[PDB]
Amino acid sequence: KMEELFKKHKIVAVLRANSVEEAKKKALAVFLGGVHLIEITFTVPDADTVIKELSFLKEMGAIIGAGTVTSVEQARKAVESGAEFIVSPHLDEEISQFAKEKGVFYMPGVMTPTELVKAMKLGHTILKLFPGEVVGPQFVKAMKGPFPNVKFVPTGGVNLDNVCEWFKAGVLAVGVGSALVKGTPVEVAEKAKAFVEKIRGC
Amino acid sequence: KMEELFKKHKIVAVLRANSVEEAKKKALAVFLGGVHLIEITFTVPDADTVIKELSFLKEMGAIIGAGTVTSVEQARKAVESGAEFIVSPHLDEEISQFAKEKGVFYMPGVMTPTELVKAMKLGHTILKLFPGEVVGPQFVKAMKGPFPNVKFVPTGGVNLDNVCEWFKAGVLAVGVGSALVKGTPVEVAEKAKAFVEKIRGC
Amino acid sequence: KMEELFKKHKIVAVLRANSVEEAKKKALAVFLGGVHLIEITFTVPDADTVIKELSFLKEMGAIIGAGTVTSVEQARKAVESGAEFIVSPHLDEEISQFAKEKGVFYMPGVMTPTELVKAMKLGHTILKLFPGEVVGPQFVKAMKGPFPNVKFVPTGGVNLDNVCEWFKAGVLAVGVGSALVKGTPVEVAEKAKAFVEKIRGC
Amino acid sequence: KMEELFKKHKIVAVLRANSVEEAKKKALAVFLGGVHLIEITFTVPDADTVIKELSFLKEMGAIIGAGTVTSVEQARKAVESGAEFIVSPHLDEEISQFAKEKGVFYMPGVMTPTELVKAMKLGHTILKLFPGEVVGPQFVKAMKGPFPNVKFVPTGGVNLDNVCEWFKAGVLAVGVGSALVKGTPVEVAEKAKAFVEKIRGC
């Protein structure tokens, strides 16, 4: 199901913000603009409260998860507050195990073939590729040779000009932060619309 | 001896293909065009059978190995079928150990200084650099400072325009996949000739 | 204090050389040109002797450390000879632990989010980013999102044209090798002056 | 079956070479370029060994025979080493008889109506016409009148410019030597491709 949602929606908003209020307003902006997968990063102050207060959007079909999860303690709080998926920038064995026992989808981040293989050995085949702007689509295309059955969701620098190249390389979905989320609510809602159209357009 | 063969031939064909028949025809094409080091990747269906059926080319001086080796079970099959060398995209401690006991040359893939150091601690000084198109010659030149005695064989994006830059950076040999191997047998045999000449030419 | 010195001086000369004499002359050149943080790499022959013979420059305010430290045995020699800080290209748990017990500042090198997190778990928040020319400022900016409290000192390709971009990305200091250190003593002393001015200039 | 293979493939490479190694490389070149009928002439040194060492290509669908067979002793060695067909430049009653008892297809060479008739009396209706460059398509057309049921495979001078004229005259297949086989492996593989296309093209 987690796989199937990424496949269908193709875009996850990676939401960094300086306050609970800003984070909630941007999550609403993004949703109102057609982005259903919303990742509340743990760099947001009181990121758990934000996830809990957005729980109602689930009734409107939003899928609210947590990102920048770097300890099992953070993972527990996110899940306790209703996170439907966990994302980290790195591969965390302890978070992998906790999410396995808890029955919650975890997408670890990877930047190398060795990291990729370790993640596969922990049962993962959908991987966050981070930072995407450093490795690029080139990395995604290179992995298709030896690891035809791994799929990536790049985060980092994905924007309006390159989103289609990423999909050409073979990515499953993209995670979009500052290109989507930075600015005012109005600007964010609008940029949300543009990304959906640009993605549909390819 | 394994080192010395890489040093002498300078190019390894990294052979991905959709069938046994295609893989064998491309391995013959490449050999006929002057490429003696042939890596049958385990993304080739029945890659073991292909290695076994190419065993006779060893009598003509071909050196047939296996690539995209990701488990010890695959490693065992490759060696059982006559592989003279094992290559992986990542650093695998279990494959390192098996190849050590079996007395077969293993070239793990590495993308970072930490991975490099771990591989050295496992006894390796000839490393696959993968994906070469992501890190580049720049990475090879950067490693010369702190690790003067490590040598790289980059795989990923090596082509006719950049092969000489790679050798300028200090690589021991190059692994060439799609630029060499994609196309028909005739086109592959011809591209094989071009790479040998271009490499000799630098 | 180690943090505070990096913060104040902003540049560390990464000194590779073919002899004790060349290394000492270049360390003097660099210091005479205004660079106070001097990293004697262990690729310098008898790098310990060089650190010991430069010990007097500490009385003039030079801070002499060791780089390219790849084993605890090398780490011990460097510290025994008066190294005030230890730098490696990779993350080394054994060197981390030794430096912790010995009470000496260690800056491990990292290239990925997973490596970064492991280093943080070992108590490090100032990280060498290596090779900087492969990942770039882009990597430093990407890390600010999920890891706002990590600071980088990139080594690899930092030069007169890009030093200000690096500081724009949010680095704590830069480690400069060949752009600073290559050439004759006179040329090195002069390039030292240029880097200090260019850094002040941004 | 022998008839039917000639009919289907339309071209037999007549392989003369100065060594075992050259002969094998050219047979591979030709096969890789789409020529399935390969005639190893007995002017090749150790022509039997070459036929035996190419025996595996039979598993890839190559049909390996012997040419320039001029005694029953040579015929025996060729058959013993796996030759699937025997070709001679002349009509040899002794080779005809041996091949009849052994159950192996023999194509004797003929240049005159009297030779043709003698071959028919020995049970042959598929004849090598040799030397084709001396008699020409004219000879093939002339034979259609009195001997409508004889079919020729000309050897001698068949090339890219005249191959279609030969087929216009009514030949069953062509045997191509120097126009196909002379040059390096790469050049031979390529010329092989050209002949197949030119033949298909008519």
Numbering used by the authors:
A (entry chain B), B (entry chain B), C (entry chain B), D (entry chain B): 0 to 201
Wording from the paper:
In the present study, we used the SpyTag/SpyCatcher technology for the assembly of SARS-CoV-2 RBD on a protein nanoparticle platform, SpyCatcher003-mi3. The VLP platform, based on an engineered aldolase from thermophilic bacteria, spontaneously assembles into a hollow 36-nanometre dodecahedral cage with 60 subunits. VLP display of protein antigen has been shown to further enhance immunogenicity by facilitating antigen drainage to lymph nodes, enhancing uptake by antigen-presenting cells and increasing B cell receptor crosslinking.
The SpyTag-RBD can be efficiently conjugated to the SpyCatcher003-mi3 VLP, with 93% display efficiency reached after 16 h. This corresponds to an average of 56 RBDs per VLP. We saw no sign of aggregation following coupling and the RBD-SpyVLP is homogeneous, as shown by a uniform peak of the hydrodynamic radius (RH) at 20.7 ± 4.2 nm in dynamic light scattering (DLS). Cryo-electron microscopic analysis of RBD-SpyVLP cages confirmed the presence of reasonably uniform mi3-cages. In addition, at low contour levels, the resulting icosahedrally averaged reconstruction, to 3.7 Å resolution, showed decoration commensurate with the anticipated appended SpyTag-RBD. The low level of density is expected due to incomplete decoration and likely flexibility of the spacers. All tested mAbs and ACE2-Fc bound strongly to the RBD-SpyVLP, showing that a broad range of epitopes on the RBD-SpyVLP are exposed and correctly folded. Testing resilience of the vaccine candidate, we found that RBD-SpyVLP is stable at ambient temperature, resistant to freeze–thaw, and can be lyophilised and reconstituted with minimal loss in activity or immunogenicity. We showed RBD-SpyVLPs to be strongly immunogenic in mice and pigs, inducing high titre neutralising antibody responses against wild type SARS-CoV-2 virus.
